[PDB]
A paper describes a structure:
The C-protein C.Esp1396I is a member of a large class of helix-turn-helix proteins that act as transcriptional regulators of gene expression in both prokaryotic and eukaryotic systems. C.Esp1396I finely regulates a bacterial restriction-modification system, providing a delay in endonuclease expression via a concentration-dependent ‘on’ and ‘off’ switch. The C-protein–DNA operator complex consists of two ‘controller’ C-protein dimers (chains A and B, chains C and D) bound to a 35 bp DNA operator sequence (chains E and F). The dsDNA is distorted in the complex, due to binding of protein dimers to each operator site, resulting in minor groove compression (leading to a 50° bend at each binding site) and large major groove expansion at the DNA sequence centre.
To investigate the distribution of specific damage throughout the C.Esp1396I protein–DNA structure with respect to increasing radiation dose, eight successive datasets on the same C.Esp1396I crystal were collected, each exposing the same 100° wedge of the crystal to X-ray radiation. For the later datasets (2 to 8), molecular replacement was performed with PHASER using the refined first dataset final model as the search model. The later datasets were refined only using isotropic B-factor refinement in phenix.refine and were similarly refined to 2.8 Å. For example, by observing the step increases in damage frequency with increasing dose for each residue type, there is a clear difference in the peak detection rate between glutamate and aspartate decarboxylation for doses in the range 6.2 MGy to 35.7 MGy. Clear loss of electron density localized around the carboxyl groups, due to decarboxylation, is shown for Asp64 and Glu54, and the rate of carboxyl electron density loss with dose appears marginally greater for Glu54 than for Asp64. Figs. 5(a)–5(f) also show specific damage to Met57, where electron density loss and side chain disorder can be observed localized on the methylthio group over increasing doses.
Residue numbers in the entry:
A (entry chain A), D (entry chain D): 2 to 77
B (entry chain B), C (entry chain C): 2 to 78
Write the structure that this text describes.
Amino acid sequence: ESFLLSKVSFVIKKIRLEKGMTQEDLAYKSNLDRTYISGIERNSRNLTIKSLELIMKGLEVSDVVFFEMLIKEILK
Amino acid sequence: ESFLLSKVSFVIKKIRLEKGMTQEDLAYKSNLDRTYISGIERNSRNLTIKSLELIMKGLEVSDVVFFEMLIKEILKH
Amino acid sequence: ESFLLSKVSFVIKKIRLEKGMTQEDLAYKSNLDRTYISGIERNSRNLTIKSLELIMKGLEVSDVVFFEMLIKEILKH
Amino acid sequence: ESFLLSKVSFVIKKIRLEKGMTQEDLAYKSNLDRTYISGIERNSRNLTIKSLELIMKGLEVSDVVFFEMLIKEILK
DNA sequence: ATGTGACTTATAGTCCGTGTGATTATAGTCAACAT
DNA sequence: ATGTTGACTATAATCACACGGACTATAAGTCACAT
């Protein structure tokens, strides 16, 4: 697997939780598949930017906040 | 098309020129086709995080540094 | 345009495919531009004996056997 | 300089002589410059196929006969 | 609720080639004077 | 006759790039069945 990919996924999971969402609800909100999301969170998926963008919409988080977070997460 | 993509697209080119690289050099070190590097910069193609990671390694730049410039380009007017 | 040129350009391609090479290998091995190899085959282009020699070295072929295949191509109907 | 380019030039000179032609006449017959011809024969020019072709027409020699000769000259 | 697996279908990514403006090196062509 | 030296100017040859079609790998999106 990839280092970045795991932290993207970790971040996605982090934010979903800090907000109190279920996967079911992140899937609904972003108009994507729930198993799709589960896959990403166990990090069994290699998103495209577009997909990442949809997940950010679903999380209701701007690109900037996401990347600010991803950076922090990246530095152990 | 996509907001984030053209930003990612823009930043890949910006860095590449800042480092005096050519598409040929880049696609070189990213072990992607020079067609793909062109494709990305040209028509903001929808790359995968893994591919983006390869390009970062190609640009001889870190995850962090890239995303910090990404944030800057998004914030601009 | 020129009789001999399209014969030369035909034979460069023939050999290139016979040896299972691609254009951009040959462009490397011949120590000429990517687009020049294309341009020679694609249209014809008016190359120099020195450049022709480089290509022959690149096709991994001798002056002699090149010209022998050149003669054969000229002689065709 | 180049081996091939030398043998080419030598051949051009050879054929010119076996036909009893002067350079002046070889240049008239192919409409090129006499100093141009001179230059090739003293191996100071790297001609293009197009030019080579004009010289063959000026020598009144077919492409095939030229290369047949060029091959033989190439083999010592 | 979340996590599998496995199975299509869209598309990301590859591979080989075409065609092009802009710049640099050099062949094409023609002087003057040689011998 | 041929040789040589500068020249000017056409174009060979370079360099960075765009663009397309066809093919291969894989992400996108949806089932069934776990827990």
